[PDB]
Amino acid sequence: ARTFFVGGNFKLNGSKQSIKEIVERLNTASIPENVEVVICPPATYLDYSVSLVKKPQVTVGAQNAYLKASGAFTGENSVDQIKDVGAKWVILGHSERRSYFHEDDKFIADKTKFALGQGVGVILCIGETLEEKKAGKTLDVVERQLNAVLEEVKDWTNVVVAYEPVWAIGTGLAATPEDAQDIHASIRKFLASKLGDKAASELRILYGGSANGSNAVTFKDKADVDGFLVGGASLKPEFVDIINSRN
Amino acid sequence: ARTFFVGGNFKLNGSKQSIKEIVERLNTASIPENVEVVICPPATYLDYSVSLVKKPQVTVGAQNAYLKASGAFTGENSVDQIKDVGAKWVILGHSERRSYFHEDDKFIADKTKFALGQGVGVILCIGETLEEKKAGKTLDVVERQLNAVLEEVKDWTNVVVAYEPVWAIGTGLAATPEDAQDIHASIRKFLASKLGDKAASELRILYGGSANGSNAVTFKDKADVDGFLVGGASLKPEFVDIINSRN
């Protein structure tokens, strides 16, 4: 009893035309009532995407936001503006911000605090690199990453956490569901100790690697994979296959 | 040439409601004929804002964008998606991005090139800090910032440059119109050594300092300040009088 959650990170992808299509396709599909989908298009299409959604199961979120609501912060996205057009989620700490935009763990910590504070949900991204994986420093990083927000955030009833196998992206290594089962279970235990087994038992831990149409079922029987944070496949029709990979 | 340009950068501020009132005011205002006005809302509101302007003189721009149109850059803004939505400009290099997100000179130059590729125009920001000003290295700071862009783009038909005296912000220090004239004259004398005087005499150099309703009027008769990159004045009734100042 953890509601299956499916998130779709469009990344720097979409157009009014393609998004329309993407959303019109949900709206229109058979999707369980008891699944939680959140689509996260560029900030440029947030208002627009909202307009378009008609199924109770889906919401939209932003792919980043700052740690202040307003002020002199040219080029950022605010959680106030994201709630203003009806978005309900924010993705924080994605590997692409961590690497390319060198957001540190305290940055994300602060960003998470602030957003949960303003009433928006947070999809928090953790995971290690190849270098880091090869030195078997995987549990280290991930608890280090989680520890920084644990410092600021005491509640977590509105956080979903997604693990991203960064070592498995463009490296030529592949993550199996067994790899994922393992790491999530582990992650869970860690959080059980900091938060209590009740709070940890209800928290969703999303698998964040290459999950797609063909795969998604592969992970239907892994008890600690509560859903997915999909990349490329979210901009495609296989997206709906994912949403139904359980039944 | 040198048609007066007035960009209003809203920074992280606005709601659907308030961007409606500022546009409406703009729609009904009796502001001059050859005047270029660009409003710069939060990404969240570009579509919407475009939808409301009905005035040949006013256009819209974004506050920052990546150096790629699409891909795996979660959280970023794309010049192509800014285009799809109908905005025409992007501010690149603002002191707030150069500082808190530390966009170095080369990133800026890279993003200027690109956006031009794609067809949007750029409001390129440059400015020295105080410390740099104290060392009397304003001219070297500004040249160095501009050269990075000269390196990559040789046609600035589409670039207006914004001069921000970051050293007059917060500091207790104040920039005069005469200050402005001096500097602009100097960055103009310098882009001519490199872009030929014709190109230079056609380049609009804006004052991105604290320009408001009440002092906008003091820069008239400053021959090298072709306009303004306004700030908080932007979200208020007096943006209009800034607009009508050259009159």
Tokens at A9, concatenated = 């990170």
Q: Using an 8 Å Cβ cutoff, are B6 and B234 in contact?
A: no
Q: What is the dihedral of CA B81, B209, B215, B228, to 10 degrees?
A: -40
* Residue B243 DSSP symbol: H
Distance CA A60, CA A114 (A): 19
Distance CA A196, CA A206 (A): 19
- Report in angstroms the alpha-carbon separations of B140 from A130, A195, A239, B176, B200: 42, 54, 53, 20, 19
Neighbouring-strand partners of residue A40: A9
Tokens at B22, concatenated = 């500022």
From chain B, the residues in CB contact with A43 under 8 A are 42-44, 77
The CATH number assigned to the domain holding B73 equals 3.20.20.70
What residue type is B122 in one-letter code? V
In chain B, where do the E strands start and end?
A: 5-9, 36-40, 58-62, 89-92, 121-126, 159-163, 205-207, 227-230
Q: B42-73: buried (b, 16+ CB within 10 Å) or exposed (e) per residue? A: bbbbbbbbbebbeeebbbbbbbbbbbbbbebb
* Residue B68 DSSP symbol: S
Distance CA A113, CA A99 (A): 21
Tokens at A132, concatenated = 């880091």
Look-up of token digits 């940055």: A107
Distance CA A38, CA A75 (A): 24
Q: Which residues contact B148 (CB under 8 A, 6 or more apart)?
A: B105, B106, B108, B109
Tokens at A226, concatenated = 């509560």
Q: Which of A44, A104, A164 to mutate to test the interface with B (most CBs of B within 10 A)?
A: A44
Cβ-based neighbour number of residue B133 at 10 Å: 18
Tokens at B67, concatenated = 């150096």
User: Hey, are the CB atoms on A74 and B97 less than 8 Å from each other?
Assistant: yes
Distance CA A23, CA A237 (A): 10
Distance CA B104, CA B82 (A): 23
Tokens at B174, concatenated = 């104040």
A163: left (phi over 0), alpha (psi -120 to 50) or beta: beta
- Report in angstroms the alpha-carbon separations of B243 from A150, B41, B180: 49, 17, 18
Q: Which helix (H) or strand (E) holds A91?
A: strand A89-92
Give the minimum alpha-carbon distance from A85 to chain B in angstroms, rounded to a whole number: 8
Q: Using an 8 Å Cβ cutoff, are A6 and A230 in contact?
A: yes
Distance CA A196, CA A190 (A): 10
Tokens at B153, concatenated = 């783009």
* Residue A223 DSSP symbol: T
Distance CA B57, CA A20 (A): 30
Least Cα distance to B51 among A16, A75, A19 occurs for A16
CB contacts < 8 Å between A and B, how many? 128
Distance CA A90, CA A79 (A): 8
Distance CA A23, CA A38 (A): 11
Tokens at B11, concatenated = 């920074």
Distance CA A177, CA A225 (A): 9
Task: Tell me, yes or no, if B170 comes closer than 8 A to chain A by beta carbon.
Answer: no
Q: Which residues contact A223 (CB under 8 A, 6 or more apart)?
A: A181, A185
Give the minimum alpha-carbon distance from B114 to chain A in angstroms, rounded to a whole number: 15
Task: Tell me, yes or no, if A111 comes closer than 8 A to chain B by beta carbon.
Answer: no
User: Hey, are the CB atoms on B12 and A73 less than 8 Å from each other?
Assistant: yes
The dihedral through the CA atoms of A5, A8, A11, A17 has a sign that is: negative
Neighbouring-strand partners of residue A113: none
Distance CA A19, CA A28 (A): 14
Q: Say which of A36, A94, A128, A184 is annotated catalytic.
A: A94
Tokens at A25, concatenated = 């396709």
- What percent helix, strand, coil does chain A show, rounded to 5? 45, 15, 40
Q: Using an 8 Å Cβ cutoff, are B41 and B10 in contact?
A: yes
Distance CA A19, CA A146 (A): 33
Using only C-alpha atoms, chain A has a radius of gyration, in whole angstroms, of 17
Q: Which of A9, A10, A12 to mutate to test the interface with B (most CBs of B within 10 A)?
A: A12
User: Hey, are the CB atoms on A74 and B82 less than 8 Å from each other?
Assistant: no
How far is residue B229 CA from its own chain's centroid? 5
Distance CA A198, CA A219 (A): 24
User: Hey, are the CB atoms on A75 and B78 less than 8 Å from each other?
Assistant: no
Give the minimum alpha-carbon distance from A81 to chain B in angstroms, rounded to a whole number: 6
Q: Quick check: helix, strand or coil at residue B67?
A: coil
Tokens at B39, concatenated = 């409003």
- Report in angstroms the alpha-carbon separations of B191 from A32, A214, B150, B185, B201: 62, 57, 9, 10, 9
From chain B residues 46-105, the ones with a CB under 8 A of any chain A CB are: 46-48, 62-64, 66, 68-78, 81-82, 84-85, 91, 94, 96-97, 100-101
User: Hey, are the CB atoms on B47 and A45 less than 8 Å from each other?
Assistant: yes
Distance CA A242, CA A105 (A): 30
* Residue A216 DSSP symbol: G
B9 is in an annotated binding site: yes
State phi, psi for A12 to the nearest 5 degrees.
-95, 70
Distance CA B52, CA B39 (A): 12
Domain count, chain A: 1
What residue numbers of A does the annotated binding site for substrate cover?
9, 11
Which DSSP string do the residues of B186-206 spell out, in sequence order? Answer: HHHHHHHHHHHHHHHHH--EE
Tokens at B156, concatenated = 């600035």
Q: Which of B13, B44, B47, B103 to mutate to test the interface with A (most CBs of A within 10 A)?
A: B44
State the residue range of the domain holding A208: 1-247
- How far the first Cα of chain A sits from its last, in Å, is 15
Cβ-based neighbour number of residue A237 at 10 Å: 12
Q: Which residues contact A47 (CB under 8 A, 6 or more apart)?
A: A85, A86, B16, B44, B45, B47, B48
Least Cα distance to A85 among A43, A56, A115 occurs for A43
Q: Report the catalytic residues of B.
A: 94, 164
Which DSSP string do the residues of B141-164 spell out, in sequence order? Answer: HHHHHHHHHHHH-S--TTEEEEE-
Q: Using an 8 Å Cβ cutoff, are A46 and A62 in contact?
A: yes
Q: Quick check: helix, strand or coil at residue A247?
A: coil
Distance CA A106, CA A126 (A): 13
Measured between CA atoms, the residue of chain A closest to residue B76 is A12
Q: Using an 8 Å Cβ cutoff, are A85 and A62 in contact?
A: no
Distance CA A24, CA A219 (A): 27
Distance CA A6, CA A201 (A): 18
**Do β-strands A227-230 and A4-9 pair in parallel, antiparallel, or remain unpaired?**
parallel
Resolution of the PDB structure in angstroms: 1.9
By CB atoms closer than 10 A (0-12, 13-18, 19+), residue A113 is: middle
**Do β-strands A4-9 and A35-40 pair in parallel, antiparallel, or remain unpaired?**
parallel
Give the minimum alpha-carbon distance from B233 to chain A in angstroms, rounded to a whole number: 13
Task: Tell me, yes or no, if A138 comes closer than 8 A to chain B by beta carbon.
Answer: no
Least Cα distance to A5 among A37, A39, A41, A53 occurs for A37
Distance CA A195, CA A199 (A): 6
State phi, psi for A206 to the nearest 5 degrees.
-80, 140
Catalytic status, residue A102: no
Tokens at A86, concatenated = 């009806």
